[PDB]
């Protein structure tokens, strides 16, 4: 099941900041931040979790229609990175495809640990 996620993608993005990958990740948690709500995501690549993912607002209908929800597996097709003053890298998801629904997956995959910031 972990073989279904892009182990090391989070570490790669955090170290290199490159956007030339299309990682498959699991949504662990989604929270709105109140114009359209901004959704923040805690995502997993099976190895690490990271809470600095944000959704571009065009993707809000995926959340609102319950396609993108906790435990679902999705592939990221386009993202950008913005690095804050303090060093945290924020990953803004621009295009993504849900591969497998939350109910199809049904649980957290594996035992990912927070990325060490």
């Amino acid at each position: 099941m972990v073989g279904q996620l892009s182990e090391g993608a989070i570490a790669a993005i955090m170290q290199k900041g490159d956007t030339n990958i299309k990682p498959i990740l699991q949504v662990i948690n989604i929270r709105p931040i109140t114009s359209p709500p901004r959704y923040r995501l805690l995502m997993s690549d099976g190895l690490n979790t990271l809470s600095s993912f944000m959704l571009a607002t065009q993707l809000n209908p995926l959340v609102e229609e319950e396609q993108l929800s906790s435990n679902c597996v999705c592939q990221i097709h386009r993202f950008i990175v913005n690095t804050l003053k303090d060093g945290r890298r924020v990953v803004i998801l621009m295009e993504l495809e849900v591969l497998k629904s939350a109910e199809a997956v049904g649980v957290k995959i594996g035992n990912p640990v927070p990325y060490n910031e």
Partner: peptide, 24 residues
Amino acid sequence: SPLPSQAMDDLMLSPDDIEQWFTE
């Protein structure tokens, strides 16, 4: 850590994660 932008990270805690502080 700790970084200023991590201040509110506990907002993102998996509900199961918090339960486990109390049972494990």
